[PDB]
Write a protein that binds this ligand. Structure first.
Ligand SMILES: Nc1ncnc2c1ncn2[C@@H]1O[C@H](CSCC[C@H](N)C(=O)O)[C@@H](O)[C@H]1O
Lengths: 32, 122, 223, 257
């Protein structure tokens, strides 16, 4: 659902409606 | 009334919030350009600036523990701090205290690097 | 891996997008909300109506000419009031001579008439809004005994309304317009109100950001 | 564009107006000096559909007689006359609240509304080309129906009637539906709003092929209310202030003669 993150029209701050926790998911997947 | 332009300003001053209105009485259009409940008050701006003095750019847990910016969003803190220095990346200023930014003028005047949107590109 | 780079570049493009939008925002960008509007954001059950009354008599010297109401009926959406809570508002003190417009659903027609007569109004009219599709046909909704294809706004009047600041037989009592987003209302009800009362004081309760207009005092929660 | 071929499709569709029924077991006629001031329980009982074909003498109407609203409370509607029946009454903008309060005092719960949106005959005639009698009006309406593909480029908002009223301009006619309980309906089979092109003199006086639509709507509200001869013995539908010459089968027509 990578393209579903921006499928809906959110406000310019909410456009990271799922990237918020990806900001740490990337870190944890880099750890292992 | 007869002169509505002053009437609306007075009603905003005496009934509306300080976020919705302004000191003179004009609409805060920046408030209405964003979703309700997600607004960056200048109080949040000065709170973040004081937090830079407290700990500076780095991890954002203790900056949201004292909650200088009340009930703030962590990624919003790590994003709005970029506009303080004018650089799209903060790897050069991690875990350090800054008194005066000193970076806006030098990074804004860099003709060699990108000057778009009052910033400096990677 | 590759998805890491893709998410990084997506995040980047959004980052410069947000930076550009915020740079224009903190440079004098105009919003869709008109100037010359009075957006009170508060709770109607807790609002100090005396403060609003004093402000209205201080800045205008007289009360509202038209009061539009869109009550959140306790039929079942998520932030609704009760019938007695809506009845308890000091509407009697917010208006002396003028009209009241109440958008009444079918389930709340009788109680709407009862509240209108309780506040001291004479039920004199009601405007029907008929819902149109994209093509131009009639929109069909759920029905109780008949397929509901319209919605009614009851209009009561009180006091001396023949001051010359209102007009007779201004326009049709039918509004044939397309169905916009949920719970929204057509924009030409405001045009009909302006035809009824040109350059007057108007008050809207339970208003939203969509309903903000010129010469308009709008009170709301999400507003 | 206009979609008037679909808005007025019923006006030409297979909905033929019904012919008057003779005085026989399929109908019933009653002649009374006054309807409101008379006992209606002896003419029929256990009704489940009572249509009051009332033409009110409101101030908007230009002094052409009619009933008086204050006399509606005088009407006696005993529980023996109907136990659980839907009451249809022709409303006016002046007396909607009074009618609602009177039906509440009598024990009826307001449930539904029905509206007719009125288009101008003269407006359609002018769009197509560029004291009338019933026959002339009917033939003009047939002509307007025939040339339905010519004015389809117009805007519907330019065709509505604009009748005088001290507050707004009249464009619809209203039929109120009240309920009383102490019926096996078919529910959403007819739209809540209908479109009709009419003359600008007496839009309140619903004419034939428009009253026929109302009759069919009322009759399809209650499919179990059909009066099949032989199996039944009493009529369960009544109309007051009916027409002296047009007797609808299966109805009790009461004439204020
Ligand atoms: N005290 C209160 N309780 C519940 N809703 C309230 C309220 N005061 C104001 N409201 C407003 O009433 C709205 C629902 S009424 C229906 C939506 C809106 N009024 C409209 O038709 O345009 C909510 O959005 C809320 O903002």
């Amino acid at each position: 659902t990578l393209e579903d993150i921006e499928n809906e029209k959110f406000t310019n701050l909410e456009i990271l409606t799922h990237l918020y926790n990806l900001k740490a998911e990337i870190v944890r997947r880099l750890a292992e | 009334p007869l002169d509505f332009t002053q009437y609306a300003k007075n009603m905003r001053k005496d009934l509306s919030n300080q976020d919705i209105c302004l000191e003179d009485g004009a609409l805060n259009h920046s408030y209405f350009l964003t979703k309700k409940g997600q607004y960056w008050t200048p109080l949040n701006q000065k709170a973040l600036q004081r937090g830079i003095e407290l700990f500076g750019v780095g991890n954002w847990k203790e900056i949201n523990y004292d909650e200088f910016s009340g009930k703030a969003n962590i990624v919003e803190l790590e994003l709005r701090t970029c506009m303080i220095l004018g650089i799209n990346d903060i790897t050069e200023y991690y875990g350090k205290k800054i008194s005066e930014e000193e970076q806006e003028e030098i990074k804004k005047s860099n003709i060699a690097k990108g000057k778009k949107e009052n910033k400096l590109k990677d | 891996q590759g998805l890491l780079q893709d998410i990084e570049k997506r995040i980047l493009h959004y980052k410069q997008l947000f930076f550009k939008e915020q740079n224009e925002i903190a440079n004098g960008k105009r919003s869709m909300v008109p100037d010359n509007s009075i957006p009170i954001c508060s709770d109607v059950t807790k609002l100090n109506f005396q403060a609003l009354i004093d402000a209205q008599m201080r800045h205008a010297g007289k009360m509202f000419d038209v009061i539009m109401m869109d009550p959140p009926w306790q039929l079942s959406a998520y932030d609704s009031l009760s019938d007695e809570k809506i009845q308890n508002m000091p509407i009697q003190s917010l208006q002396q001579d003028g009209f009241i417009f109440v958008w009444a659903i079918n389930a709340k027609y009788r109680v709407t008439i009862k509240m209108i007569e309780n506040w001291g109004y004479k039920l004199v009219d009601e405007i029907t809004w008929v819902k149109k599709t994209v093509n131009g046909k009639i929109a069909k909704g759920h029905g109780f005994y008949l397929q509901h294809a319209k919605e009614s706004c009851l209009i009561g009047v009180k006091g001396d309304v023949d001051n010359g600041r209102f007009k007779k037989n201004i326009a049709s009592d039918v509004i044939f317009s397309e169905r916009r987003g949920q719970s929204q209302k057509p924009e030409e009800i405001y045009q009909y109100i302006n035809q009824l009362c040109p350059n007057g004081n108007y008050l809207e309760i339970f208003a939203r950001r969509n309903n903000l207009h010129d010469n308009w005092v709008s009170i709301g929660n999400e507003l | 564009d206009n979609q008037l071929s679909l808005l007025l499709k019923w006006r030409n569709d297979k909905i033929p107006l019904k012919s008057a029924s003779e005085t026989d077991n399929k109908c019933k006629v009653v002649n009374v000096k006054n309807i409101f001031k008379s006992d209606l329980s002896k003419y029929g009982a256990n009704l489940q559909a009572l249509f009051i074909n009332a033409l009110w003498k409101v101030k908007s109407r230009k002094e052409k007689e009619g009933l008086n609203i204050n006399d509606l409370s005088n009407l006696k509607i005993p529980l023996s006359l109907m136990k659980n029946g839907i009451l249809f009454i022709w409303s006016e903008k002046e007396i909607l609240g009074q009618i609602v309060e009177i039906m509440e005092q009598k024990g009826f719960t307001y449930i539904e509304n029905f509206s007719i949106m009125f288009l101008g005959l003269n407006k359609c005639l002018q769009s197509i080309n560029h004291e009338k009698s019933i026959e002339q009006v009917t033939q003009e309406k047939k002509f307007v129906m025939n040339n339905l593909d010519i004015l389809k480029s117009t805007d519907i908002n330019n065709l509505f009637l604009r009748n005088n009223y001290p507050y707004f301009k009249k464009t619809r006619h209203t039929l109120l539906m009240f309920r009383r309980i102490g019926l096996e309906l078919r529910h959403q089979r007819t739209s809540d709003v209908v479109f009709e092109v009419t003359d600008e003199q007496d839009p309140s006086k619903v004419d034939t092929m428009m009253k026929e639509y109302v009759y069919q709507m009322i009759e399809t509200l209650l499919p179990k209310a059909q009066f099949i001869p032989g199996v039944d013995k009493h009529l369960k539908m009544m109309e007051l202030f009916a027409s002296t010459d047009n007797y609808r089968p299966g109805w009790i027509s009461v004439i204020e003669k």
